[PDB]
Amino acid sequence: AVQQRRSSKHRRDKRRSHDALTAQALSVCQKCGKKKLFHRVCSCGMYGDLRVKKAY
Amino acid sequence: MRIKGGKQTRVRRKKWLKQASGSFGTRHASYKVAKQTVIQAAKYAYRDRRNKKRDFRSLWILRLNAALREQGMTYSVFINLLKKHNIEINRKVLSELAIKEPSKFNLIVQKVKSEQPK
Amino acid sequence: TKGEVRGGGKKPYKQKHTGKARQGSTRNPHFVGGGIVFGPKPNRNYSLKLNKKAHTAALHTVWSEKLASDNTHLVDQNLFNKTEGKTKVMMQFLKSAKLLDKNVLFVVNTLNTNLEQSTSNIKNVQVKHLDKVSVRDLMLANALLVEKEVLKALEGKFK
Amino acid sequence: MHAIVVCGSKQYLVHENDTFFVEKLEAPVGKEIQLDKVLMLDEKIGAPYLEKARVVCVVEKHGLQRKVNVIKHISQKHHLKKYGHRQPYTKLKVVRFVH
Amino acid sequence: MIAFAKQFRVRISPQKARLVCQLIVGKKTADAQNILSNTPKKAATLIAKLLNSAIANATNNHGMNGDALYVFECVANQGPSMKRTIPRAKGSSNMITKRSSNLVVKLSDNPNERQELIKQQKALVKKRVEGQQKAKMARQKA
Amino acid sequence: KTSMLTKEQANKRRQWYIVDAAGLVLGKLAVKAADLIRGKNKVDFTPNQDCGDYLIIINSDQVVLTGNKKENEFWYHHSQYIGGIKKVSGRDMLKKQSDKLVYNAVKGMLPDNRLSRRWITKVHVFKGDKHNMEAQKPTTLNWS
RNA sequence: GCGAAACAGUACCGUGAGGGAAAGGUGAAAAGAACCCAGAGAUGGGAGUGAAAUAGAUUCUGAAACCAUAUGCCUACAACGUGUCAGAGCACAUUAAUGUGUGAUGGCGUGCGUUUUGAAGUAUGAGCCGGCGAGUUAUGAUAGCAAGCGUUAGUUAACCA
RNA sequence: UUCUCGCAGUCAGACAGUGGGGGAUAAGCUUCAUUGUCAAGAGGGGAAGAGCCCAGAUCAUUAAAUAAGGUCCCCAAAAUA
RNA sequence: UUGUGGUAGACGAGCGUUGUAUUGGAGUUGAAGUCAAAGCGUGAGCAUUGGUGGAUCCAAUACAAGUGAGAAUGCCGGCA
Ligand SMILES: [Mg+2]
Ligand SMILES: [Mg+2]
Ligand SMILES: [Mg+2]
Ligand SMILES: [Mg+2]
Ligand SMILES: [Mg+2]
Ligand SMILES: [Mg+2]
Ligand SMILES: [Mg+2]
Ligand SMILES: [Mg+2]
Ligand SMILES: [Mg+2]
Ligand SMILES: [Mg+2]
Ligand SMILES: [Mg+2]
Ligand SMILES: [Mg+2]
Ligand SMILES: [Mg+2]
Ligand SMILES: [Mg+2]
Ligand SMILES: [Mg+2]
Ligand SMILES: [Mg+2]
Ligand SMILES: [Mg+2]
Ligand SMILES: [Mg+2]
Ligand SMILES: [Mg+2]
Ligand SMILES: [Mg+2]
Ligand SMILES: [Mg+2]
Ligand SMILES: [Mg+2]
Ligand SMILES: [Mg+2]
Ligand SMILES: [Mg+2]
Ligand SMILES: [Mg+2]
Ligand SMILES: [Mg+2]
Ligand SMILES: [Mg+2]
Ligand SMILES: [Mg+2]
Ligand SMILES: [Mg+2]
Ligand SMILES: [Mg+2]
Ligand SMILES: [Mg+2]
Ligand SMILES: [Mg+2]
Ligand SMILES: [Mg+2]
Ligand SMILES: [Mg+2]
Ligand SMILES: [Mg+2]
Ligand SMILES: [Mg+2]
Ligand SMILES: [Mg+2]
Ligand SMILES: [Mg+2]
Ligand SMILES: [Mg+2]
Ligand SMILES: [Zn+2]
Numbered sequence A: 001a002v003q004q005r006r007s008s009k010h011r012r013d014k015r016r017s018h019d020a021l022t023a024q025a026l027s028v029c030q031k032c033g034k035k036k037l038f039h040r041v042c043s044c045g046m047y048g049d050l051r052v053k054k055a056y
Numbered sequence B: 001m002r003i004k005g006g007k008q009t010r011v012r013r014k015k016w017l018k019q020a021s022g023s024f025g026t027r028h029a030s031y032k033v034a035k036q037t038v039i040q041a042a043k044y045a046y047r048d049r050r051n052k053k054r055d056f057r058s059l060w061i062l063r064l065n066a067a068l069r070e071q072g073m074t075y076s077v078f079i080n081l082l083k084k085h086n087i088e089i090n091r092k093v094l095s096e097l098a099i100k101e102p103s104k105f106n107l108i109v110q111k112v113k114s115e116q117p118k
Numbered sequence C: 001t002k003g004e005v006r007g008g009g010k011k012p013y014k015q016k017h018t019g020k021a022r023q024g025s026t027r028n029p030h031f032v033g034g035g036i037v038f039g040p041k042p043n044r045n046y047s048l049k050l051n052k053k054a055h056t057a058a059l060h061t062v063w064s065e066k067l068a069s070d071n072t073h074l075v076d077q078n079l080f081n082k083t084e085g086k087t088k089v090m091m092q093f094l095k096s097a098k099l100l101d102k103n104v105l106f107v108v109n110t111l112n113t114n115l116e117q118s119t120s121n122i123k124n125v126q127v128k129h130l131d132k133v134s135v136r137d138l139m140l141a142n143a144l145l146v147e148k149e150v151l152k153a154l155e156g157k158f159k
Numbered sequence D: 001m002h003a004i005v006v007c008g009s010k011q012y013l014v015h016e017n018d019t020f021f022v023e024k025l026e027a028p029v030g031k032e033i034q035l036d037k038v039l040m041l042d043e044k045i046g047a048p049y050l051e052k053a054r055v056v057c058v059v060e061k062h063g064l065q066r067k068v069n070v071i072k073h074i075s076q077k078h079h080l081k082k083y084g085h086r087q088p089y090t091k092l093k094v095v096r097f098v099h
Numbered sequence E: 001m002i003a004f005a006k007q008f009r010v011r012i013s014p015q016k017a018r019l020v021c022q023l024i025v026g027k028k029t030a031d032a033q034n035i036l037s038n039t040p041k042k043a044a045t046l047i048a049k050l051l052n053s054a055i056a057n058a059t060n061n062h063g064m065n066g067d068a069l070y071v072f073e074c075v076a077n078q079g080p081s082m083k084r085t086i087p088r089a090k091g092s093s094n095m096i097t098k099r100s101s102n103l104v105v106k107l108s109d110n111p112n113e114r115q116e117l118i119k120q121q122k123a124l125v126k127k128r129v130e131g132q133q134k135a136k137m138a139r140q141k142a
Numbered sequence F: 001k002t003s004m005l006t007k008e009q010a011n012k013r014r015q016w017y018i019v020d021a022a023g024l025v026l027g028k029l030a031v032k033a034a035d036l037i038r039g040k041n042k043v044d045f046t047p048n049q050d051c052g053d054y055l056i057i058i059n060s061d062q063v064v065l066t067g068n069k070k071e072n073e074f075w076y077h078h079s080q081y082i083g084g085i086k087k088v089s090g091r092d093m094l095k096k097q098s099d100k101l102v103y104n105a106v107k108g109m110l111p112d113n114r115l116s117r118r119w120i121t122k123v124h125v126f127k128g129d130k131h132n133m134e135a136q137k138p139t140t141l142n143w144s
Numbered sequence G: 001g002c003g004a005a006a007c008a009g010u011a012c013c014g015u016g017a018g019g020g021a022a023a024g025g026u027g028a029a030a031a032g033a034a035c036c037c038a039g040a041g042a043u044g045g046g047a048g049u050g051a052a053a054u055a056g057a058u059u060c061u062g063a064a065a066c067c068a069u070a071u072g073c074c075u076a077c078a079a080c081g082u083g084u085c086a087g088a089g090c091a092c093a094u095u096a097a098u099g100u101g102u103g104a105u106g107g108c109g110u111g112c113g114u115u116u117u118g119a120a121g122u123a124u125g126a127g128c129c130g131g132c133g134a135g136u137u138a139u140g141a142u143a144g145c146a147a148g149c150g151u152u153a154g155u156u157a158a159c160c161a
Numbered sequence H: 001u002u003c004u005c006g007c008a009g010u011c012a013g014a015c016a017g018u019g020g021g022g023g024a025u026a027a028g029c030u031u032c033a034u035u036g037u038c039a040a041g042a043g044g045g046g047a048a049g050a051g052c053c054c055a056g057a058u059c060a061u062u063a064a065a066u067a068a069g070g071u072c073c074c075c076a077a078a079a080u081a
Numbered sequence I: 001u002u003g004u005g006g007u008a009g010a011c012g013a014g015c016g017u018u019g020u021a022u023u024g025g026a027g028u029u030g031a032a033g034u035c036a037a038a039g040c041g042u043g044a045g046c047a048u049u050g051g052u053g054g055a056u057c058c059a060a061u062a063c064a065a066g067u068g069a070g071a072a073u074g075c076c077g078g079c080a
Helices: A009-016 B009-019 B031-069 B075-084 B091-100 B102-114 C052-066 C077-082 C087-097 C113-117 C135-139 C148-158 E014-021 E029-037 E047-059 E113-141 F026-038 F090-095 F098-108 F116-121
Strands: A026-028 A035-037 C105-108 C126-129 C144-147 D002-007 D010-015 D019-023 D032-035 D038-041 D054-061 D068-074 D079-085 D089-098 E002-010 E070-078 E082-087 E093-098 E101-108 F017-020 F055-058 F074-078 F085-089 F123-125
Touching: B009 B031, B031 B075, B031 B091, B031 D068, B075 B102, B091 B102, B091 D010, C052 C135, C052 C148, C077 C113, C144 C148, D010 D019, D032 D089, E002 E047, E014 E047, E014 E070, E014 E101, E029 E047, E029 E070, E047 E070, E047 E101, F017 F026, F026 F055, F026 F098, F026 F116, F074 F090, F085 F090, F090 F098, F098 F116, F098 F123
Parallel strands: C105 C126, C105 C144, F017 F055, F055 F123
Antiparallel strands: A026 A035, D002 D010, D002 D038, D019 D089, D032 D054, D054 D089, D068 D079, E002 E101, E070 E101, E082 E093, F074 F085
């Protein structure tokens, strides 16, 4: 099955209206300050008060 | 002598495109659809000039008829009374009187009501 | 045209069952390869015929209006060789005669060489024999200097 | 104060210092024209037309209306005719109502 | 006062880049960098490089303060495409169109910049009309 | 050219009215209700500004249908399913829901339009003498 | 315009005979952007040369279709060949003109070519844009119109200068 | 609308009324004669309709009188007996 | 005064493109091209101003045509 009529440039954008993106939640590390996405280990491997991995 | 087309096609096409300004999407972008819309819009305008002449007459008849029913007299007889009294006034101007100068409109109805025909 | 243009005399696509339209050659007029349907040809005539007496009548009237008019002075043999072959003297002559902007045409019967040596670097003026002037050269002149013996031959030619 | 005049074929209700547009009258700008056909004036309305009731008007301009393009087209019949129309008018303002 | 940076023939498609570009319009400098550094998209590590270069040449070349810059307009125009032949089945063939985007990011310090753009547009339209009037005075003069 | 006529710019002289349908015929009441709702009887009628007054109907169950229409004439409503065509006789409508019958009758006398929605909205029909619409201080007119 | 303005009968297709493309323009002069900043780099932003760098090697001019951004207007109870005639409100000010941009709302309204007795067509042709694309030439005949020459008229063909 | 000369297009028609043939006094059937329309003709009536009725669109006007048809509402316009 | 619906078709009058021949004129103080605007015509069409552009172009009278694109499941290029 294929469109017997071409879809205009307006119906196309109406369908894409739901394709917008969402900003992932970010937080501040409590020892170095850079922004990191929430509930995840920072770049230094320091999550909460526990040293997880060696610094980058 | 190889005559080459240029500035001739585009100018006569852009004239049609300019006329079809304010249309929905491709109906103003593409020359072909624009040309069809201008021709169709011209047909509508032509037919609706005639229809405007009739529809505005109807509105004057409607407003005057309504204005009359408040005084107890009807449209079918008001025009008949106008002819016997020889008074010649448009329904347009008569309706304009009844909306802007109610008192003077009542003067016209009072004379046509009872005064001797001619 | 379509036949002279180098190309394949075969059918590009099959006649049927292909989504493309029917085509018969790659050098058709509506193709980019280019076969001009009619086109200009190098066999055209461009020539026209006018009767002999009609040409005499046309020449007769053109002489009538140009002669007996302004800038239709008469010239003789002395100054046709007094030019000395130098175009500076003739430029002075045109300046003195106030014929600088005019397209003066010398009508000459004896083909003087000193006069022909000059007036050749001047794109404006020109000199012709009686058997060489035509209607167009006569009425493009706007001014002409005619020799006396040229005028006598003119009456003879008209008859 | 108000009058019902007949200029051309239309009837206009006019007040003092009112400018209305009528069909071309062939009169230069600035003259003082006298509209003749008057139906109603003040309160005395004449049956055919009022007698001696005159409307004094001054002609302001002799411009033309907006261009109208009449494109007659017979669908699928090889007929596309085009025409343009610019109807001339004249604008005039009421100065005085002759008794 | 617009500072800007450009990048020609970016491999990302304009369709997939405008989606990320709408996440950065109107944002402050520091907040703009933070959002783009933690978004799992391919067209995030290229606008970030362009954004950083634009900040650099705004506070170094044009001499801007640096704590008032906001992303004025970040868009991905359509760049030149590349045509390839993908071999299909039964002897047929299709055309793959490798799409490219021309990325440009622009940041300003004044929060009223749309007004100045309209002012130059108004000046150009205005500049056109007096010439018409000047031509009319000359025409009446003759 | 000529002088244009005066037209109201969405001017609202709309007022509230009360009518009593004690023994009025369905059609005779509906025709005047539509004329009153549309404002056609008004002196100045601009047919794009809904210059028509509100109207309230009292005693809907008390209306009458002449002849044998109470048992021989049927009102029809079909849902979008199959077999969802519900039929009610005149007598059943006059008892169970009389307000809906007058509502449908008044709506049917209006032009198919985007303004007819607001026009049918301005009809407040009640089945009893009581009504919660006494806060508008609606004037009383007879046979309308 | 020769298929071929460039290294074209080349690239490429076919076992082979054979078939057979596209692609030109910086600036007067490379003076072709040293140097600084961001970047891994290409590159970009400044600086510099230049009359011009929005002439920067992507290199004369840069159209439309197409894709994005934005000032202003409208749009989430609404049956729509999408326009037309009326018509509020909103926002501006012009080839000064009963001005321009949008259009709450009312009335009316089933495309363009083709071929048919008859097409909104459940017949047909076109996805859109731009370029190209179809009554000619040679030699004769007839008729209309006009000119030259005329009542032992009128007119030359080849060829020669 | 006759005569002479130049240039054509047309040779698939349709429906309505009237008189018939074929068909079954069936066909929006088929074949004729005649009056009209459409073809190549918009507007108004018929709710919507090529052919039925009223008629023939040069353009503009928000002027007036009418034809067929109609006057509770949609939708312009009525009352008496 | 009589008129002016119209397909096939007949007849008449004009517009526009390029070039040539004669006249005149404009142009680095900015030509053609090209975009925009609230202009002029009965129609093909024609101007004015401003931006971009960097070297040719315009008016009149004649002449000669590869002279007018919306459709051919048209060709080529680009883009949906
Ligand atoms: Mg869009
Ligand atoms: Mg989606
Ligand atoms: Mg063309
Ligand atoms: Mg060729
Ligand atoms: Mg294979
Ligand atoms: Mg090989
Ligand atoms: Mg640069
Ligand atoms: Mg490019
Ligand atoms: Mg370029
Ligand atoms: Mg709403
Ligand atoms: Mg609802
Ligand atoms: Mg409906
Ligand atoms: Mg509607
Ligand atoms: Mg509408
Ligand atoms: Mg419709
Ligand atoms: Mg055609
Ligand atoms: Mg057929
Ligand atoms: Mg359909
Ligand atoms: Mg089929
Ligand atoms: Mg077919
Ligand atoms: Mg198709
Ligand atoms: Mg095309
Ligand atoms: Mg002849
Ligand atoms: Mg027959
Ligand atoms: Mg037959
Ligand atoms: Mg019959
Ligand atoms: Mg029969
Ligand atoms: Mg029979
Ligand atoms: Mg039949
Ligand atoms: Mg036919
Ligand atoms: Mg008809
Ligand atoms: Mg009808
Ligand atoms: Mg006529
Ligand atoms: Mg009658
Ligand atoms: Mg009515
Ligand atoms: Mg005619
Ligand atoms: Mg020319
Ligand atoms: Mg220019
Ligand atoms: Mg051609
Ligand atoms: Zn950390």
